[PDB]
């Protein structure tokens, strides 16, 4: 779960 | 009916790599309507219904950095990429 | 404790995860206003805008965000931005490029 997650 | 003629020139060590000149040569005449668009996958800069400039494949193209100036008196588009 | 910036960001992310994308954008905007060189505001805003179907605006936010990510320290966030960009570009196929009407070319532009 990374690219589609905000930062 | 407009009569467009295109010139292209490459540059080294500058903020841009390419300059495109689009010139209307038709004497009589009509004002030029321009709604350019850039297609990312094609790497083609469409100018209007008539005209499209595919861009050289060896150039990094950032649509944010495509600068287009229009000088009406000269009926000339200057495009810097 | 979280800084003001970090609390605004966390609030934005909470709204995002809730599916309140417009409000999230409203927080991320404050991130961009406070730290215009911080890529995270741009990346987050772009993701929210994408969730809203505002692909052209998302593209603009990625374009702006990537200005700040050219050094090694930002590689990770760079990847994020590049993902969003490629998503949004992919969605629209093309964008309008504005024509600037001028009496003469501004300085630094070769007429030769």
Numbering used by the authors:
A (entry chain C): 718 to 724
B (entry chain B): 264 to 344
C (entry chain A): 0 to 111
Reproduce text from the manuscript describing this model.
The R2TP complex is found in organisms from yeast to humans, and consists of the AAA+ ATPases Rvb1 and Rvb2 (human: RUVBL1 and RUVBL2), a TPR-containing protein, Tah1 (human: Spagh or RPAP3), and Pih1 (also known as NOP17 and Pih1D1, but referred to as Pih1 henceforth; Kakihara and Houry, 2012; Te et al., 2007). Here we present crystal structures of Hsp90-Tah1-Pih1, Hsp90-Spagh/RPAP3, and Pih1-Tel2 complexes that together define key structural links within the R2TP core in yeast and in animals and reveal how R2TP connects the Hsp90 chaperone system to the TTT complex involved in PIKK activation.
The C-terminal 20 residues of Tah1 beyond the end of the fifth α helix of the TPR domain has no coherent structure in the isolated protein in solution (Back et al., 2013; Jiménez et al., 2012), but is fully ordered in the complex crystal structure, and forms the majority of the interaction with Pih1 (see below). The Tah1-Pih1-CS interaction buries ∼2,036 Å2 of molecular surface, which is in the range typically associated with constitutive interactions. In the Tah1-Pih1-CS complex, the Hsp90 “tail” peptide binds in an extended groove lined by the helices forming the TPR domain, and interacts with residues from the first, third, and fifth helices.
